[PDB]
Write an enzyme that holds these catalytic residues in place. Structure first.
Site, short mmCIF file in Angstrom:
data_model
loop_
_atom_site.label_atom_id
_atom_site.label_comp_id
_atom_site.label_asym_id
_atom_site.label_seq_id
_atom_site.Cartn_x
_atom_site.Cartn_y
_atom_site.Cartn_z
CB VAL A 1 21.63 49.19 41.42
CG1 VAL A 1 20.50 48.70 40.52
CG2 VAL A 1 21.04 50.07 42.52
CB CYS A 2 26.88 48.50 43.31
SG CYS A 2 28.00 49.38 44.43
CG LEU A 3 24.83 52.03 38.64
CD1 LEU A 3 25.89 51.17 37.98
CD2 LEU A 3 23.79 51.14 39.30
#
Length: 154
Positions: free
Chosen positions: A85-87
């Site tokens: 993920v990359c949030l």
């Protein structure tokens, strides 16, 4: 284990708050720092299943953001094919030690429900979505049915 203490209260609080879009919350005794469960979306085809995710939340929580990795295959641009993920909730530039798993989990649910094709992990998956959500929806229906976790009946 300082982090773990907070993570324990925050977990109980999470379930209590309404384990709906986030269910099968579990925590190990020893590795209680790491979390596992699934998230039940609404928008994408949850009828066939759900998305299992694991949130590695080290003792270094107040020093650095956690990582998340989906166990089940994904078709959501906000996550990578390797479940990564990359949030902003856990982004390095937005590493807030004031954040917790409530912010993390609600992020996945928020982005798995309502994906931002603005600048996600795989713009490509966001492109086919943004041109045609119908192939996203139908591919999801199958993806869920292949490797999506079995969402509960309730």
């Amino acid at each position: 284990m300082a982090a773990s203490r907070r993570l324990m209260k925050e977990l109980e609080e999470i379930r209590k708050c309404g384990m709906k879009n986030f269910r099968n919350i579990q925590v190990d005794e020893a590795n209680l720092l790491t979390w596992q469960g699934l998230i039940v979306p609404d928008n994408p085809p949850y009828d066939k299943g759900a998305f299992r995710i694991e949130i590695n939340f080290p003792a270094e929580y107040p020093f650095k953001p956690p990582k998340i990795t989906f166990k089940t295959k994904i078709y959501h641009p906000n996550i990578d094919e390797k479940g990564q993920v990359c949030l902003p909730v856990i982004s390095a530039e937005n590493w807030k030690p004031a954040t917790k798993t409530d912010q993390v989990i609600q992020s996945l649910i928020a982005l798995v429900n309502d994906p931002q094709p603005e600048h996600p992990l795989r713009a490509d998956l966001a492109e086919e979505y943004s041109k045609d959500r119908k192939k996203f929806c139908k591919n999801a229906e199958e993806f869920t049915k292949k490797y999506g976790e079995k969402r509960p009946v309730d």
